[PDB]
Design a protein around this nucleic acid. Structure first.
Lengths: 153, 56, 465
DNA sequence: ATCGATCGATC
DNA sequence: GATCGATCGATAAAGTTTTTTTT
């Protein structure tokens, strides 16, 4: 029943990408800013998005944006499927990511007990003692050489 | 006064604070009875004041 | 009444025996502390639990000894101290409901009747440290007096599990409730679902908090030869990171013991290790009212407030009116009159003093340390040039980098009290000019660069030669 | 030296 | 085809006085 709920938030976010959140007409603020987000992307080829917490809260009035705040440890490999469907219908090797930003509140590191498994929480602080740049895997072409090793898990 | 008082009364009966107690502690030295008195009052110390207020 | 293989505890008489004792109290204990109280603290406080919605009732729990009955309940608390708090968490939910059944307008009988409240029996009995903890003390209340040392962050705990095998959709959620996780050896959710790859999706089921703290007792009349030893702590409720390391402490702990594996890769085990589990701990923007503002405006009506603050700063000091001027003035440390572009001046100034040795030069500085809650205190080579900030130190927990701030940055909201400004080394006494001028500390260390500021305010207590 | 895993044999 | 038994392989260890530049 979360499948169709995951399918509900699939199209409701997609329908949000069909509209804008533009309040002023030709006084600045050109309409359909997410369509232009695809348009800048198909020139410089950076493979990103950039969505804010405001304009998705103020479409379903918190009936949907409050749901993803406690579930998108699971819902993150769901919304990627819908945008992968809308890109062929709106645009012409394709890996992406989901980049939320600008939640209202800001916490410190001393406040992480139980609600912070699968949530979204902006955290401040400073950074020390970095490391190098190595590759990760996420997808294999590996299989056994018994008969044919073309199994792609 | 915990049943060894028969030997604690001996200081109270005989008295002799200023010199017998001075010759009591460290009798193995040459002279200097004045300076062995300067230590024994520090062995009993002496509390300054139960101050109560914030005057440590 | 029921009978358990483990305990011998009763059925809910003692709950009702508490509930009449709780409600029909109004006063007791007047005889054990005979001095010569119209209503009980808890009677108002049990109404006070709902109207704030909290979950904690700090029970003094020396009331059953004052009451005529409930001694059997009292002397079962100190002998089976896990089921008795497990009983009373059910009753306090119902005893709260015993107030909602009177007034049905109290939070709609649903939502505050879901979050489980709890209790805290504290300051009960007496104990005397560590060299009395016999092996017979297996499940009892203990009252430690000591000092905590160092803390680790919270690790999670298996309170609920999850499973999913390789079928289309099968999202069962088994429980644990033990030290044992139980699994199926054959699939479900369909008829033709044979024994297959049941997988463990770990990052889906929720966890609570948990934290271990190390304690070492204070040398409280120790017989001057014995080394003060140590014991650990453990916590479960919402008391994580509310007890910072390095304070005088008292805990109301139960007792437990765990096994350990000798070899790291076998199931072999035998000299155990004990640890306590705390139920309640105790150490030993202000809420601005309006009566204080009305009280100081009477003092502000008095023109001699300068002279009134001249006489208040000296409870024992000789008069010496001139030094008392700037000290309260530096304590009244201006504000940050900062422009948008240009300037960035701050009204903080810097007084000093030097002269006759030991004229309460330190005790005045101690007296200034009284009047400010968040400040510093200098030492005799407690800090140094490299010992102030800019650390590399190989700490005993992780052997990695840590950048702890110096005292001049640490006075963000205080007054830097500092001394020995004729015996300070000339490797240092070179960076305070920067915090005199750019209000910052520039760090040139192998870790990283940072121009962090320091909202500071200084005074200097020199010495003659 | 002990425990765990894999392979082979028997039911 | 599944279960039980036997055989083979893999798993457990520990540090803190001389010597360099440097302040």
């Amino acid at each position: 029943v979360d499948d169709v709920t995951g399918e509900k938030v699939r199209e409701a976010f997609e329908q949000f990408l069909e509209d804008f959140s533009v309040q002023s007409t030709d006084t600045g603020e050109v309409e359909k800013v997410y369509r232009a987000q695809i348009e800048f992307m198909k020139i410089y080829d950076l493979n990103t998005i950039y969505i804010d917490y405001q304009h998705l809260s103020m479409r379903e009035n918190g009936a949907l944006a409050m749901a993803i705040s406690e579930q998108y440890y699971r819902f993150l490999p769901f919304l990627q499927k819908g945008l992968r469907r809308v890109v062929r219908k709106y645009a012409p090797e394709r890996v992406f990511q989901i980049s939320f930003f600008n939640l209202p509140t800001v916490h410190r590191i001393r406040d992480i007990r139980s609600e912070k498994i699968g949530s979204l929480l902006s955290i401040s602080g400073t950074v020390t003692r970095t490391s190098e740049v190595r590759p990760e895997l996420y997808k294999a072409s590996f299989t056994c050489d018994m008969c044919r090793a073309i199994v792609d898990n | 006064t915990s049943d060894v008082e028969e030997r604690v009364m001996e200081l109270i009966t005989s008295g002799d604070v200023y010199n017998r107690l001075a010759k009591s502690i460290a009798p193995e030295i040459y002279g200097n009875l004045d300076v062995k008195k300067a230590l024994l009052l520090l062995l009993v110390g002496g509390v300054d004041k139960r101050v109560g207020d914030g005057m440590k | 009444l029921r009978i358990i293989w483990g305990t011998n505890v009763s059925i809910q008489e003692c709950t009702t025996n508490f509930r009449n004792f709780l409600m029909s109290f109004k006063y007791k204990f007047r005889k054990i502390l005979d001095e010569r109280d119209e209503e009980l603290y808890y009677i108002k406080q049990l109404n006070e639990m709902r109207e704030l919605g909290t979950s904690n009732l700090n029970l003094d729990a020396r009331n059953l000894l004052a009451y005529k009955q409930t001694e059997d309940l009292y002397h079962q608390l100190l002998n089976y101290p896990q089921e008795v708090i497990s009983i009373m968490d059910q009753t306090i939910k119902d005893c709260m409901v015993s107030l909602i059944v009177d007034n049905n307008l109290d939070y709609d009988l649903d939502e505050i009747e879901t979050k489980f409240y709890k209790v805290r029996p504290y300051n009960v009995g007496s104990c005397k440290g560590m060299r009395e903890l016999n092996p017979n003390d297996i499940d009892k209340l203990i009252n430690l007096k000591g000092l905590v040392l160092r803390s680790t962050p919270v690790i999670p705990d298996m309170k609920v599990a999850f499973f999913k095998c390789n079928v289309c959709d099968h999202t069962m959620a088994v429980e644990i409730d033990r030290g044992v996780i139980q699994e199926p050896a054959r699939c479900e959710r369909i008829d033709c679902n044979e024994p297959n790859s049941m997988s463990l999706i770990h990052n889906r089921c929720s966890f609570a908090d948990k934290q271990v703290i190390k304690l070492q007792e204070t040398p409280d009349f120790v017989p001057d030869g014995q080394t003060p030893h140590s014991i650990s702590l453990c916590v479960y409720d919402e008391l994580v990171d509310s007890c910072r390391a390095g304070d005088r402490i008292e805990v109301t702990g139960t007792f437990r013991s765990i096994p350990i594996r000798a070899n790291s890769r076998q199931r072999v085990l035998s000299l155990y290790k004990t640890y306590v589990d705390v139920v309640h701990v105790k150490k030993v923007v202000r809420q601005i009212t309006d009566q204080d503002l009305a009280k100081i405006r009477e003092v502000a009506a008095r023109e001699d407030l300068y002279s009134l603050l001249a006489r208040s700063i000296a409870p024992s000091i000789y008069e010496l009116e001139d030094v008392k001027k700037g000290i309260l003035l530096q304590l009244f440390g201006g504000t940050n009159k900062t422009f948008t572009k240009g300037g960035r001046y701050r009204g903080d100034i810097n007084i000093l003093l030097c002269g006759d040795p030991s004229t309460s030069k330190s005790q005045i500085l101690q007296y200034v340390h009284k009047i400010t809650p968040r400040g510093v205190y200098t030492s005799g080579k407690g800090s140094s040039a490299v010992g102030l900030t800019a650390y590399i130190t190989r700490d005993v927990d992780t052997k990695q980098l840590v950048l702890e701030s110096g005292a001049l940055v640490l006075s963000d909201g205080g007054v830097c009290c500092i001394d020995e400004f004729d015996k300070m080394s000339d490797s240092t006494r070179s960076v305070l000019h920067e915090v005199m001028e750019q209000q910052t500390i520039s760090i040139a260390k192998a870790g990283i660069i940072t121009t962090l500021n320091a909202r500071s305010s200084i005074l200097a207590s020199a010495n003659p030669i």
